[PDB]
Design a protein around this nucleic acid. Sequence first.
RNA 1: UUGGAGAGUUUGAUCCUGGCUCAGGGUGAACGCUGGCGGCGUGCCUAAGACAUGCAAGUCGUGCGGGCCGCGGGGUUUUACUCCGUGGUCAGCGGCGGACGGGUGAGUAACGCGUGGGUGACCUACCCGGAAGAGGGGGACAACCCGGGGAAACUCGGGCUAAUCCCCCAUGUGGACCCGCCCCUUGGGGUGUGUCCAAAGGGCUUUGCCCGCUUCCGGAUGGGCCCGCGUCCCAUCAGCUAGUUGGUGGGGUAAUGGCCCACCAAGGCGACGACGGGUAGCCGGUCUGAGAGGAUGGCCGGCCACAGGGGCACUGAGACACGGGCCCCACUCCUACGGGAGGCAGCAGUUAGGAAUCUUCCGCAAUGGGCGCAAGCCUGACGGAGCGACGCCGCUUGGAGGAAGAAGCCCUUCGGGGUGUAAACUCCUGAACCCGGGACGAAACCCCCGACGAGGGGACUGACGGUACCGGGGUAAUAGCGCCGGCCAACUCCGUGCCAGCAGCCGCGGUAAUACGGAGGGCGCGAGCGUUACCCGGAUUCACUGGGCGUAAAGGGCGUGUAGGCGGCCUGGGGCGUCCCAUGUGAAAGACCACGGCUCAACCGUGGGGGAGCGUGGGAUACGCUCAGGCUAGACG
Lengths: 99, 104, 208, 83
Amino acid sequence: RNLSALKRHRQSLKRRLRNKAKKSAIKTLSKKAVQLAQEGKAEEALKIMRKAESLIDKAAKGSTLHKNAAARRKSRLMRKVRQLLEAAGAPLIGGGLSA
Amino acid sequence: PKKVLTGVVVSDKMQKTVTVLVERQFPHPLYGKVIKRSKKYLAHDPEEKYKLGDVVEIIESRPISKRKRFRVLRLVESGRMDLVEKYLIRRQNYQSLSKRGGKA
Amino acid sequence: GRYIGPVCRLCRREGVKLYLKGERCYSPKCAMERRPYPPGQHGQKRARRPSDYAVRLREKQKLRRIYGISERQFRNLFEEASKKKGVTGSVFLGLLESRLDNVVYRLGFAVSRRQARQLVRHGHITVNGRRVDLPSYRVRPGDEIAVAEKSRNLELIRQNLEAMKGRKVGPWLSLDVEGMKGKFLRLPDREDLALPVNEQLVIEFYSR
Amino acid sequence: MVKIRLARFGSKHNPHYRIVVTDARRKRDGKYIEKIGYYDPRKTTPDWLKVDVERARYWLSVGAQPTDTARRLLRQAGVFRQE
RNA sequence: UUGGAGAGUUUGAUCCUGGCUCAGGGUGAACGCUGGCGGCGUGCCUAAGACAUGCAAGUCGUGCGGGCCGCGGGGUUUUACUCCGUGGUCAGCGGCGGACGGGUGAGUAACGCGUGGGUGACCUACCCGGAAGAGGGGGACAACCCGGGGAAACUCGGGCUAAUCCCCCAUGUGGACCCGCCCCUUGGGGUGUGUCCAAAGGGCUUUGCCCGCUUCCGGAUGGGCCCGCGUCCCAUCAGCUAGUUGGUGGGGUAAUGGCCCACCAAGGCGACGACGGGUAGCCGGUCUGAGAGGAUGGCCGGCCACAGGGGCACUGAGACACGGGCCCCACUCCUACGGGAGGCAGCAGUUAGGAAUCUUCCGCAAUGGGCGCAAGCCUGACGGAGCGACGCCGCUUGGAGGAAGAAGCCCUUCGGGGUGUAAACUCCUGAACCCGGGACGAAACCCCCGACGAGGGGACUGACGGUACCGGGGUAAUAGCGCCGGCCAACUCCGUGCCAGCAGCCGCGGUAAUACGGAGGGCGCGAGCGUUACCCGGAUUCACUGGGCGUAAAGGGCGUGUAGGCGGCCUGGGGCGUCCCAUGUGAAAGACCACGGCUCAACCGUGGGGGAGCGUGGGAUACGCUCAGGCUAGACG
Ligand SMILES: [Zn+2]
């Protein structure tokens, strides 16, 4: 007993994958930008954060990132960075950081 | 209007949190006499200012911990253990009246 | 089963003449004439003192049996008579006298009450212009209770009105024989009723 | 999307409607927001329709698509007559 | 002041106590005897057992590409092949709906629900309004074609390709995040530098109009979380707790939060009943009651919870999602025994259980809802019919006349009384039944004019139903059940003989029965009447209103004093209780009053009024409370 009201499931799969490849994207890049500030790579750290901040707001554009969700993400990354760069001051670029 | 209550700090063993005894009076729903009931509300002292035996005002706030939905407003009257004692003795009496073993 | 059976049997049980047949309950025979003792093998027997309920009972019955209404409706009336401001008793009687069937009786269009109902359920009764077959219809004040155009030429109704030249009509009602019409002026007052009842006893009855 | 529509209140063969304002998603016979006049199909009384435009315009102003039938009634009231 | 009735029963007799019993009202009822009609309402209360069959959510070609079957037309002299337009059909990709509506009450004693509040801890699709913009570039996967696996359900792999699917880049009205400052004051607002983020097109009456698109502020509606108060029984349940209570950081969410994790601390609750057990969705209301109160929460409405049992997440504005998904379990079915397919607590229905609860009906006309520019599609939401005296309300089985009184049946003091105006018989009316006419509900969307605005004109369209209803004609045309000792309205004969039997209670019956069984007669009620069950009532017999304890049941064997309850005279402050005022709330339906609708009423509409409780503001201060001061009559020395 078939129902054409399963296409939704037939489609959910496509989105499941869809969202997945995007979120995991973030996770990784963030976790990359983070380890950089540890070592004190004030140049590329911001080079990556920027690639992050972009991905993030891009997921909010769609259905991936709830909305304010993206916001948390952003606050949790920049704040986590800046604090680290206290071990080796002076941001070379000054990309994702107002001052 | 955020609810405001008045009571006494009876517990001072917790970190940043203080137990407040809040007495309430009211006519009994059928027997009409004024019965006096009460409740302990866990307040929230950031600066560890409020001490035992202090009468404080409570004010409904943003949830903080499981069971601690109130912040302390101001102090009303410092220096009044007489109230706390009552809380304490009643507690003590509670150690009695069981099936473990009664003595003197 | 809105009753319908032996009539002057009740004229008999109550000890009070009950005008249930119109003509005849006037000729030496509504039965009460010459035979006042109640029905049954035991009519001629000595009657023991009637217990409080007993009296309240028969006094309720006398009323009910008069208009010949089923207890079910009688009760309902009394119930609604109690929700109205006024005297729980006189107001009762008011509604009772407000019935389409009854009105036709007082208006004289019918020999008796019983005959009145039929006159209605067979549609010989106009009301403000439209016919009506439901007797339980309550006539409001200022209504033009009439006769069916069709029914005017009736061997019955005709012989009845002929009698109305000589009889006065209830003080709260008017009628134009020459035109077989008649109106309901206002709710009649207890001081305006002739019944041989005692409302108080009827009310008392319903508080048991 | 809050609509403006009817609501049954008559009885078996005795239909009596209630022009009201309520969230789309609720029932016909469900808790409304603000009743604004009634309508009677059969029209047994000379007074078989009422509206109080003052409020009716509030809503449309705020954003409340009314029914095909509903709008019809509001038109008779003179809800939209800009003369 | 619109409101309150009691009786029987412990004795030889009396009074009190006291229990038992009854009369009343009510029901989603069931059972018995009886059973004509209509309107409105209502109908699994038990196995939240198991469930065949069908139907219960879809819809858009004015978002994109094709398959099948066929028709018309082009390029071909012709043929094959091919190009356009098109009908039908199918599914796919994409959008929107599936998170509503419908069921049900298992669980749940809880912020679950009620009520009043908070959100500087939040979201909100479509709708409305307001501001800004849509610039350039590229990609994937079905369908479709080719191949393989399997019994099956279904699945694998290779290749093509469109789009309002997806992704990149630029613009940035704006918006996000960090940091700084100004204001505010828990995560509110302003602002500056840095960084990051937009977007689709389609249709026509195609130089403009419609639909749709993007960012942002506002609105509206809807909802998350949180707090005060309220919320059943057992103490023959008294101590409960280890993420348990709190803290710091981190995670996670729309967001507060032990929600989760790590570490730190040792807490948190309980006789104002913790924990344990039992039971039960909550409420507006509804039943009863003079009231307080008790009982209840189906039908309708609101909130919650589950959708065979348990677990989990995805997608999404929203789900942890009854007719979507993953897993385990129990069950049922197909099976080549590897492995699968199922969930009526949707409608109807089946079976089981039971005292007991319906038609596999009609219609999509109306009202609503989804999708659509629309025509329109879906809509067992719904509107209707049908079945059930299950309730209620209305209706009938006739009316008038007619004996000092028929017959028959009963009673007798045998003379007569009774059934009884009852019949018969007289006349009159005329439900049923027959013919004819025959409905509101229904006017929109659409179309046309007008400016797709306002305004105006035109068309279509009923399940009920040929039903209601009107006209005409027209037959005299169902009655039953309980009861007749007291309570309790209604009394005789016979049969019987502590038997047979009645019986709510007291009791009745052993040859004289107003109490058994029939009969005449009588009372009560009438398409109904009884019965049993259950709720309130009587019962002031759990006693707030409104009880008691010498002997009727009842003072603790006595003292001590804990918690608690309660407390003297005068003065003042505060004004928490307490009282008055204003205000928001107290949805709707119901109840009430009034007016009206359907020939009445039941039923329904419309309008008015009332209210306890809580929020905020204002006021009063006797009395209670509190603080202060003073007294001496209580107490103590
Ligand atoms: Zn008579």
